[PDB]
């Protein structure tokens, strides 16, 4: 239940002092804001600790290195799949709102 | 029975156990995640200090203390000390939204110790003292 606006704004016929002082008018706009914008560091830390304790000899850290590499590959795959899937959208939402726009005036 | 996220009530007859101990008797790992340092202290169920570890004591100095990596390092050190003092399962109480809040827990676990509970005891005055003034940069 949206908060009431009865008697909240400084208006004539409103005895009490204003409750809200909206910087912008409280009128629904016909658009929505544009969607607003490290990975796999555990495996990296494991591999780097193994390197530190083994003098970075990859010979004795093969499992950790392979896990790190596969994790990076999966991170790339996740980025790609996420991008394609992301491609409701603000564009669609704005189109719908345009179809049914706000009317803050009299026709 | 079914799993409940709430802790058992002291004085109530509960079935949960850890290492043949009741919940009240599990040692407590007080984490303190300040803005630029993460301290850890594992006390017994009778507030007997067992292990200590802090970002500074781990060698980090200046800004490097306030890093999740430093928190993990301190947690691992504290967990090792507690493990050699004979601690398996711990109750974690962390007071502070410092950067080490969760990385300290991760380091503590990677040190071997198991966590049974997580408690937030961040001090939140009910409008008590007046904090220092804002920062204009």
């Amino acid at each position: 239940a949206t908060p009431s606006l009865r008697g909240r704004l400084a208006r004539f016929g409103n005895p009490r002092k204003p409750v809200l002082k909206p910087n912008k008018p409280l009128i629904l706009a016909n658009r929505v804001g544009e969607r607003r914008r490290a990975t796999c560091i555990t495996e990296m830390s494991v591999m780097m600790a193994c390197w530190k304790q083994n003098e970075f000899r990859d010979d004795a850290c093969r499992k950790e290195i392979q896990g790190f590499l596969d994790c990076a590959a999966r991170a790339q795959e996740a980025r790609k799949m996420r991008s394609i899937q992301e491609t409701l959208l603000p564009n669609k939402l704005n189109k719908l709102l345009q179809r049914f726009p706000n009317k803050p005036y009299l026709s | 029975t079914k799993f409940s996220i709430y802790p058992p009530i002291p004085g109530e007859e509960s079935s949960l156990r850890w290492a043949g101990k009741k919940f009240e008797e599990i040692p407590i790992a007080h984490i303190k995640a300040s803005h630029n340092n993460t301290q850890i202290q594992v006390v017994s169920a009778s507030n007997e200090p067992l292990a200590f570890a802090s970002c500074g004591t781990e060698g980090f100095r200046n800004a490097k203390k306030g890093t999740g990596i430093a928190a993990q390092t301190a947690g691992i050190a504290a967990a090792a000390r507690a493990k050699q003092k004979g601690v398996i399962h711990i109750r974690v109480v962390v007071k502070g939204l410092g950067p080490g809040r969760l990385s300290a827990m991760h380091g503590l676990i990677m040190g071997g110790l198991e966590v049974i509970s997580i408690t937030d005891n961040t001090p939140i005055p009910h409008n008590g003292c007046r904090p220092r003034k804002a920062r204009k940069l």
């Binding site: - | 937030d120 220092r132 804002a134």
Partner: protein, 85 residues
């Protein structure tokens, strides 16, 4: 002075500390403690506190009204039933 380990305490299920921490942080956020601490770090002078509160109230009103409109119009996202004409 209250009993310890009853307030803001969560029990990890199977040892998934990450899940337990997520639940705890959800609790704190929904109760507002996180925002309260972030704001209490530095004293917010009463005028600024009132301005921020009023701004957040207006933002919530606008957001809730926009959400109501979006839900109300969501049923009209169908395909055009009179394509062409």
């Amino acid at each position: 002075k209250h009993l310890k380990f009853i307030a803001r305490t969560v029990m990890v299920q199977e040892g998934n500390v990450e899940s337990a921490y997520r639940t705890l942080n959800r609790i704190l956020t929904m109760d507002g403690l996180i925002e309260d601490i972030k704001h209490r770090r530095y004293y917010e002078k009463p005028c600024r506190r009132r301005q921020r509160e009023s701004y957040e109230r207006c933002r919530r009103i606008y957001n809730m009204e926009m959400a109501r409109k979006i839900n109300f119009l969501m049923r009209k996202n169908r395909a055009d039933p009179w394509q062409g004409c």
